[PDB]
Amino acid sequence: MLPPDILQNGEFETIYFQTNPTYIKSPIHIPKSTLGKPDTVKIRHFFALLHQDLVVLGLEVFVYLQIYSDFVEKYVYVSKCDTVGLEKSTIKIGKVIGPVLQYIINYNGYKIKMKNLEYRTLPKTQNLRLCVATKPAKEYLFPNSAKNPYKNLLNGQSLLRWWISIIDSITKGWNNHKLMIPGADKYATRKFIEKYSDWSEGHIFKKDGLAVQAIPLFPDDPKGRFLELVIVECRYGKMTVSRFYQELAYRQEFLLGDCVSLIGCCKENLEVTYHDDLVSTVTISEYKEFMNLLKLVDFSDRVEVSNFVSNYRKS
Numbered sequence: 001m002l003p004p005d006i007l008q009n010g011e012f013e014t015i016y017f018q019t020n021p022t023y024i025k026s027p028i029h030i031p032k033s034t035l036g037k038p039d040t041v042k043i044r045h046f047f048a049l050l051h052q053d054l055v056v057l058g059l060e061v062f063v064y065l066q067i068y069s070d071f072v073e074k075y076v077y078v079s080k081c082d083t084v085g086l087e088k089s090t091i092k093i094g095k096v097i098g099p100v101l102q103y104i105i106n107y108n109g110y111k112i113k114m115k116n117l118e119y120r121t122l123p124k125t126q127n128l129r130l131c132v133a134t135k136p137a138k139e140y141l142f143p144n145s146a147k148n149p150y151k152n153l154l155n156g157q158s159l160l161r162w163w164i165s166i167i168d169s170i171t172k173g174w175n176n177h178k179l180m181i182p183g184a185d186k187y188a189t190r191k192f193i194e195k196y197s198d199w200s201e202g203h204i205f206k207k208d209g210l211a212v213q214a215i216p217l218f219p220d221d222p223k224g225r226f227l228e229l230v231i232v233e234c235r236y237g238k239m240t241v242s243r244f245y246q247e248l249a250y251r252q253e254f255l256l257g258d259c260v261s262l263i264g265c266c267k268e269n270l271e272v273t274y275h276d277d278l279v280s281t282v283t284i285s286e287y288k289e290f291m292n293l294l295k296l297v298d299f300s301d302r303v304e305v306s307n308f309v310s311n312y313r314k315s
Contacts, residue, residue, distance in 0.1 A: 001103045006091055012056070015048040015312060017280035019287045021112045027064060027075070027216040029236065038073070041065040041112055044287055045104050049096055053306040055299070057083045057093055058141045061104045062218070065112075071125035071269075076105050077218045078132040082141035084299050085151025094166050102170040105130060109277035122274065128267040129204055130171060133222050134160045135253070135260045142299035156259030160192055167263055168196055174267040178202045181261045182249035203245065204264035211244035212236040222253050222260060 006012060019042075026040045043063045049056040060080040066073035078101070083093055105128065112120040136156040138146030145151055154162060164179070171177060177199040181189045186201060193199035206214035217227045226248050230239050254260050282290075290312070298304045 002096065002099055006096060011051070012091075013050040015046070015050065017046055017282050017287070017290075018110075019044040019284050020281050021065075021110045022284060023113075023115060024064075026066065027218060028066075028214065029210075029212040031213070036068055038066040038068045039115055041067060041110070043110060044079075044284075045107075046287070046290070047100050047104075050309060051087060051090075053309045054086050054302065055084050055142070055305055055309060056087070056091075057081075057096065059097055059100055060141065061101065063104065063107075064216070065110070065122065067120075067122060069123070071123050071127060073129070074126050075129045075131060075216060077216075077221075078130075079219065080140045082139065082145070083151055084142050084145050084305070085148035086145075086299070086302060086305065088150050089152065094162065098166050098170055101166070105170065107277065108272050109275055109279070111276075111281070124271050124273070126270050126272045128174070128265075128270060130167065130263075130265045131204075131216070131218065132163060132167065132263045133261070134163045134263065135222060136258045139299075141294065143295060143297065144301075145299040147300055156257070156261075157192075160259055160261050163261075163263060164192060164196065164199070167265060168199070171265045171267070174198070174265050176200065176204060176264075176266050178204050178264045179261065180245070180263075181259065182245065182251075182254045184259075203262060204266050205241065207241060209241060210236065211239045211241045214241045215244065222251070223248065223262065225253070226251055 001016065002014070021041045021043050024040050024042045026038065030037055041064070045061045045063065046058070048058040058080070059078070062077045062079050064075040064077070066075070081097060112122065114120050134156070136154060136159050138153060146153065168177065177196070179189060179193055179199055179201060180203050189201050212227060212231060215223055215227060217224045226244070230236055230244070248254060293308065297308045
């Protein structure tokens, strides 16, 4: 999951666990009368890097498996990424996030129960979709870390360049790499990817038809929040994909935001081998319990951070 030059035989330690794979309703609306409706299985991944008894950084990723008869549409959604900054940075954050994210993308050892009505065997054909929204915020996972002396806080354009760099490095050879910056003109968007030959402006989803039938509604996502509104106001039947992205640009999050951007990459028709890889797996309740404990930690306070960490080690 990480190279030895980073871990350094115990100087650093990791927290990594997944939820047990859980069936959910599709994050992309599928009509009841649609040929070959797929089963959706969701897995939450949490990763943190530790240095002695302090947290250094964290990454939360959700994987969605849309399981059809002969293939899987696999969505990998970056939920949260953050640093603590209590100590002087000794590793470049990207050299950890990149490899961890690649690991999660390519992980294929899920223990999926049969759907009601042993374990399920997934199709070998997988189509990958990686989805990341870049939105500058002082804290995404570690409350009160913004005032920490060594937390390097990127502005929106810098954060975007950083994510493009990270994602490009772990999607080598993928079928597309899409950048959208809602509300920006094409030249402004093109500037960020002029040095990336495989990247183009736009998005990875179905271009036509109703937005709710094309765009996944992910938790705590800028598109997701707008999709939620479209659905609540029962406009799911009228709002097209093009109009959705047009109007998304005028949302307060975007129009008052700092270079808030949407990245998507695809890889089609990857044959994959199932491989069991023994990692810690927890119930969703255990996962939520951990995340709730996290949100009550003052990450400007070494005492509380050390306490949180040692308490996790106890389990």
